Nucleic acid binder design. Structure first.
Lengths: 378, 80, 86, 68, 85, 79, 74, 82, 165, 162
RNA sequence: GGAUUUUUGGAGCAGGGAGCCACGCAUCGACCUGGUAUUGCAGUACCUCCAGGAACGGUGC
């Protein structure tokens, strides 16, 4: 096998994919814009387009129609980028043949399926125009990633966690809204004004589950951003900074839950048996807490959006709440791309129950009619 | 029972069954009785040691079933 | 009187303990006379029920999915988390 | 007071898994609502024990050695 | 039914409640409960007073339980005696 | 079709010596001649024996009523 | 005998010395005072034989039905 | 007579229950039903060979109960009246 | 549809024999089932059942005398139809051992058809030789071998061979 | 005729003659092995006979796959991470394919459970020492080309190539 | 409304010792080397026999 051909086909496929996700970014600029905006608040350096472009949903001169679909295409582009990364990887890693090419001369076959099957394999399933999804990701379904209450990233469902929380505090004095008020705590509040004692079991377990949820939700709602990049960023921030909490009065706080006069005693405390014990037992929890913190910060807009939703639904009536639910439901299960003679009938013999077996086990109400079935189209 | 109706709904689907002894039987549910007696076909069985085997036809008594895994095709009885 | 003690926890995420000592966590959607249970998005745990075990919270976890458990083999249930909204 | 749906398995050779890690093989000759079975030409897994009664109580699983 | 509680094997329990006498209950848990029968039923559920629970672990052990309810399935044997005396 | 209860009724009439497999106990089985039985499969056995499969030892019992709880399986023996 | 059933057999054995084996391998010898519909059993002057050896002399005893393996007249 | 009826009266009592599997349960009864299925709150449950876990709520299948240890204060003679 | 194999090394355990048999014969078409016992009577033998008949004929001709676990296997068409085939599916001379017909020309010849017919121990009558070289009269000692030859070239891209029904 | 979940979903599924769950992928003219995820790891073995596959590669993690029938294809190369996606691969039938160099069979050394191997009707077969080379480089094989790997061959393959 | 498929139980109990490595007893099964018998058209508890090997597997105490 001549490597030249393989590497060629690779560069060609990469080109094909770039072209596909570029065509996408073209039809609906939001796809990139959306993504980029979020990226902006994670990696501050990122340069973002002119606001006007974002609003008018245009890339150069033409303003494109505003578009579940955005998210869909974002996950599709996600798998595309996965393919691309794979190919890039493998890639990083004459007369003799022309003679054997003479093999099997006599085949009556038309061969127009190398670039067409690929170009096609990655383009905007149906006969003509029913499903935006490419053949590449024809079995991609968002509803298996997002619940109905999340509305493809619009809201995050925290009712469940309100339940678990009630189970944690061993009472009922806590309302959904007071619970959200609790969540708001999450750079210093969640640490110095904790809902519960941060050494409580139930509490730490809860916090773990919740943290995990928030993180998965985050990356779920923003497929286009490099997950590994974000993860590593946060981890390094955790290791390198998080005596990051400093007070002019009490000094330096340690996530041992104690302060320290000066940096000196703080350092000579990070080798002590106490801190060794704690950092060796409560490491995973501390880290998870931190993640909950930063991921909730990155999702401030979604948190607010949901809290709002809560208050709304709460201030609804019965009919209102019902119709709203109807709406959320429809949004959830909708295609991502839209396209008298009484004795007369007895006398005449009609309205009498009868059945034809060969036709759909069909029912006929009259004998004259069924006798007319014998000559019919169906 | 409500769960029983949902079980009968899985007839004709591929299901997984663990017995009271922990043998794990996966295949097509042909018939499910009221008492949880289960007729299945074209089975893969995974014993407690990990080894697999293949069976054409089986029938397991309801009492000696620990649990069943049904498709997720059913999940969509929300009234109760 | 009320019959509610099971119906209350319906739709909630529930931690169920089996007679061999397994832990089944799923969404409690249905029960009956025998306490045969219907558990959506159900996973099985063996080693632990985590209360924030600093080493790890999860070992021998298995994704099962939609589970019907027979009541014969059920021991007990506690509330694990609130209902998922979906 | 239902019957087990076993008419399909009547007069077929079967493999019976019983409690205690016990296994026997034989031809189904009949049954009742408790799933008690009559098994003919039965063999303990191998030694021939003839026609026997298996109490449904102690029946874990059966497998047909034939096509039904 | 009362007749069957009165004269049948459960008369052991019927007699213990009436006379407020002690009985030793051999139990499935490999433990033995020694005390007085305040109430009982078909299943041999019981409400017991002044219960001395005894078992072994070899080391013998015991413990006092003033008031308790026993689910009757755990019953192996129930013994009446010159124990109360 | 032969019904299981009837098989027993046959065992009874025949006075065939019977060997019973017990529930969750493999090392011991019981033997005897069924004289009568009831709706719960409780059996009255004559000249009955405990059979130790491990020790090859037999314990002589005489008149036995075995609760049906223990019955796993019923077989006939020539002896 | 012409069909001798469980129930009559046990009733004939009331007033008699019996030994009951339990599923758990304990054995109890005594005079059968009575039995009931569920086959719960009442012994007097009971003795306990464990490993076939006299262990304890117990007196009057109720045995729950589910424990019983078999009963023998003796 | 039917002693489950007696147990059904013990809502809002705190008890210790020993299970068939050896587990020990201490909590406040919210409800006992006809199958002796028992429901509790503010529960400290100690599986055999663990340190306790605390649960806000726990629901026990009735058959899995060995026995209830009742409050010493409990006025049995009152509760046994129907 | 079923081929009968004999002269097999009977030291191979039954489940291994059947699995290698399945593997080896999968190259010609889907094998529906394999019947092989170790009784005195049946040891060293096996019945291999294929969904397609052309697959059975191809297998027979191509694996005749193939070294399997040390011995050269001998293959033949089975005497009767397999129970599984009869169930999946639902004249007195048939199966017949004389196949006469034509539609097999193209420089074809008598030593050609005589060697193709020769492949079979049933090689008895072979009539392919006039200017024709396209009329084939084949008398095969027995229908297992006539059926073997016929099943071997049962679609000589389409020739016409008609048993002397 | 790309391999597809849609293709895989309408494919004959059955319990084969050796009592294993098998998927029938035969005779579709598949050129590249891909999208196996959709089988959901539910098959003991897959029948890929009579297709146009060039390389035995592209498999997802499939823990239950124990038998691979790959007869009459165009296999000329074997992928390098096969054990990482097929840990219990026990039987591999490659009859009538295109493996030409002994070194191209090297990736099979990493399949720890591989016990039944068939490479007949491949040019590689006629290479000097082909059998001994396979035995030394893939010692986990017990039956090669339907013949028992014997001790004497193992020793002989230990001399040559030691 | 305690008698075989659920809620009045068939449960209960038994493992460390020796210097990371190795392990008592009983039963059953393939199983592995040699050698040897059979050439038989079937739908199957298993399937020749003879000698040697088991730092093999399962179950119970």
């Amino acid at each position: 096998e001549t490597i030249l051909e393989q590497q060629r086909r690779y560069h060609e496929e990469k080109e094909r994919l770039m072209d596909v996700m570029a065509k996408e970014m073209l039809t609906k600029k939001s796809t990139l814009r959306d993504q980029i905006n979020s990226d902006h608040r994670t990696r501050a350096m990122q340069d973002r387009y002119m606001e006007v472009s974002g609003n008018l949903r245009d890339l150069y001169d033409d303003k494109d129609g505003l578009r579940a679909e955005f998210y869909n295409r974002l996950k599709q582009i996600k798998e595309f980028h996965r393919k691309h990364p794979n190919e890039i990887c493998v890639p990083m890693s004459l007369k003799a043949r022309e003679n054997p090419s003479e093999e099997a001369q006599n085949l009556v076959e038309f061969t127009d399926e190398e670039g067409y099957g690929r170009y096609l394999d990655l383009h905007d399933y149906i006969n003509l125009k029913a499903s935006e999804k490419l053949d590449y990701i024809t079995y991609l379904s968002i509803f298996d990633q997002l619940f109905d209450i999340p509305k493809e990233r619009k809201n995050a469902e925290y009712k469940r966690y309100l339940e678990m929380l009630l189970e944690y505090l061993q009472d009922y004095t806590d309302r959904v809204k007071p619970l959200q008020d609790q969540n708001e705590l999450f750079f210093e509040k969640k640490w110095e004004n904790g809902t519960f004692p941060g050494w409580p079991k139930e509490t730490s377990s809860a916090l773990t589950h919740a943290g995990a949820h928030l993180d998965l939700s985050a990356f779920s709602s923003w497929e286009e951003l490099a997950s590994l990049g974000l993860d590593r960023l946060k981890s390094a921030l955790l290791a390198l900074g998080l005596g990051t909490l400093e007070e002019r009065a009490q000094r330096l706080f340690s996530t041992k839950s104690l302060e320290s006069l000066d940096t000196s005693l703080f350092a000579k405390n990070p080798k002590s048996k106490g801190t060794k014990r704690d950092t060796e037992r409560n490491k995973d929890i501390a880290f998870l807490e931190a993640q909950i913190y930063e991921y909730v910060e990155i999702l401030g807009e979604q948190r607010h959006l949901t809290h709002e939703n809560v208050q709304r639904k709460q201030a609804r009536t019965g009919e209102e709440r019902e119709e709203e639910e109807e709406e959320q439901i429809s949004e959830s299960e909708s295609e991502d791309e839209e396209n008298i003679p009484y004795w007369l009938y007895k006398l005449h013999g009609l309205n009498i129950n009868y059945n034809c077996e060969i036709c759909g086990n069909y029912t006929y109400r009259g004998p004259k009619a069924f006798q007319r079935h014998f000559a019919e189209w169906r | 029972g409500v769960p029983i109706k949902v079980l009968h709904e899985a007839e004709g689907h591929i299901v997984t069954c663990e017995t009271n002894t922990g043998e794990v039987y996966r295949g097509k549910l042909i018939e499910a009785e009221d008492n949880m007696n289960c007729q299945m076909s074209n089975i893969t069985v995974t014993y407690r040691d990990g080894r697999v085997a293949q069976l054409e036809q089986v029938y397991i008594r309801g009492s000696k079933i620990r649990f069943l895994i049904l498709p997720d095709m059913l999940k969509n009885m929300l009234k109760s | 009187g009320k019959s509610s003690k099971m119906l209350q926890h319906i739709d909630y995420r529930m931690r169920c303990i089996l007679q061999d000592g397994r832990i089944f966590i799923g969404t409690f959607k249905a029960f009956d006379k025998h306490m045969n249970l219907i558990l959506c998005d159900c996973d099985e745990f063996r080693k632990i029920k985590p209360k924030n075990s600093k080493q790890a919270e999860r070992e021998e976890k298995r994704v099962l999915g939609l589970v019907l458990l027979r009541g014969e083999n059920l021991v007990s249930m506690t509330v694990e988390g609130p209902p998922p909204k979906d | 007071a239902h019957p087990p749906e076993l008419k399909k398995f009547m007069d077929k050779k079967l493999s019976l898994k019983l409690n205690g890690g016990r296994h026997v093989q034989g031809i189904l000759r009949g049954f009742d609502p408790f799933m008690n079975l009559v098994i003919d030409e039965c063999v303990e897994m191998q030694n021939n024990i003839g026609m026997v009664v298996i109490r449904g109580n102690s029946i874990i699983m059966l497998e047909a050695l034939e096509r039904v | 039914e009362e007749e069957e509680f009165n004269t049948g094997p459960l008369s052991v329990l019927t007699q213990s409640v009436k006379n407020n006498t002690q009985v030793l209950i051999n139990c499935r848990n490999n433990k033995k409960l020694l005390g007085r029968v305040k109430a009982f039923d078909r299943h041999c559920n019981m409400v017991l007073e002044n219960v001395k629970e005894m078992w072994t672990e070899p080391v013998n052990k015991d413990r006092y339980i003033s008031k308790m309810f026993l689910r009757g399935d755990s019953v192996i044997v129930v013994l009446r005696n010159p124990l109360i005396a | 079709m032969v019904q299981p209860i009837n098989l027993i009724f046959r065992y009874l009439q025949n006075r065939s010596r019977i060997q019973v497999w017990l529930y969750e106990q493999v090392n011991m089985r019981i033997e005897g001649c069924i004289i009568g039985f009831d709706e719960y499969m409780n059996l009255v056995l004559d000249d009955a024996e405990e059979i130790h499969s491990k020790t090859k030892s037999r314990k002589q019992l005489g008149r036995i009523m075995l609760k049906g709880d223990n019955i796993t399986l019923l077989q006939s023996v020539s002896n | 005998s012409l069909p001798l059933n469980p129930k009559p057999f046990l009733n004939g054995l009331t007033g008699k010395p019996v030994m009951v084996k339990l599923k758990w391998g304990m054995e109890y010898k005594g005079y059968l005072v009575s039995v009931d519909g569920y086959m719960n059993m009442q012994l007097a002057n009971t003795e306990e034989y464990i490993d076939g050896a006299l262990s304890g002399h117990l007196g009057e005893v109720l045995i729950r039905c589910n424990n019983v393996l078999y009963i023998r007249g003796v | 007579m039917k002693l489950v009826r007696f147990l059904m009266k013990l809502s809002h009592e705190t008890v210790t229950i020993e299970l068939k599997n050896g587990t020990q349960v201490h909590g406040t009864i919210t409800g006992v039903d006809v199958s002796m299925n028992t429901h509790l709150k503010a529960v400290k449950m100690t599986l055999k060979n663990r340190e306790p876990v605390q649960l806000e709520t726990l629901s026990i299948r009735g058959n899995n109960i060995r026995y209830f240890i009742l409050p010493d204060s409990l006025p049995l003679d009152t509760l046994l009246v129907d | 549809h079923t081929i009968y194999i004999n002269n097999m090394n009977d030291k191979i355990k039954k489940e291994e024999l059947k699995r290698s048999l399945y593997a080896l014969f999968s190259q010609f078409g889907h094998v529906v089932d394999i019947v092989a016992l170790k009784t005195m009577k049946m040891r060293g033998q096996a019945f291999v059942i294929f969904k397609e008949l052309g697959s059975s004929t191809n297998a027979l001709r191509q694996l005749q005398g193939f070294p399997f676990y040390g011995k050269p296997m001998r293959i033949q068409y089975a005497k009767t139809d397999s129970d599984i085939i009869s169930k999946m599916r639902g004249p007195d001379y048939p199966p017949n051992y004389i196949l006469f017909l034509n539609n097999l020309p193209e420089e074809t010849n008598e030593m050609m058809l005589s060697m193709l017919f020769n492949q079979f121990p049933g090689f008895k009558e072979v009539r392919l030789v006039p200017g024709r070289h396209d009329i084939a009269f084949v008398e095969f000692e027995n229908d297992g071998q006539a059926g073997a030859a016929r099943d071997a070239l049962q679609g000589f891209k389409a020739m016409k061979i008609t048993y002397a029904k | 005729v790309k391999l597809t979940a849609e293709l895989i979903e309408q494919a004959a599924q059955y319990t084969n003659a050796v009592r294993d769950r098998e998927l029938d992928l035969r005779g579709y003219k598949i050129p590249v092995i891909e999208n196996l995820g959709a089988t959901l790891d539910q098959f003991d073995a897959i029948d890929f006979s009579d297709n146009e596959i060039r390389k035995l590669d592209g498999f997802p993690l499939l823990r239950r796959l124990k038998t691979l029938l790959v007869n009459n294809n165009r296999i000329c190369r074997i992928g390098e991470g096969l054990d990482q996606a097929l840990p219990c691969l026990t039987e591999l039938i490659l009859t009538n394919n295109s493996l030409v160099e002994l070194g191209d069979l090297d990736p099979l050394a990493s399949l720890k459970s591989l016990t039944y191997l068939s490479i007949l009707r491949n040019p590689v077969t006629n290479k000097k020492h082909y059998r001994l080379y396979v035995i030394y480089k893939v010692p986990q094989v017990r039956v090669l080309d339907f013949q028992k790997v014997k001790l004497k061959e193992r020793q002989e393959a230990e001399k040559m190539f030691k």
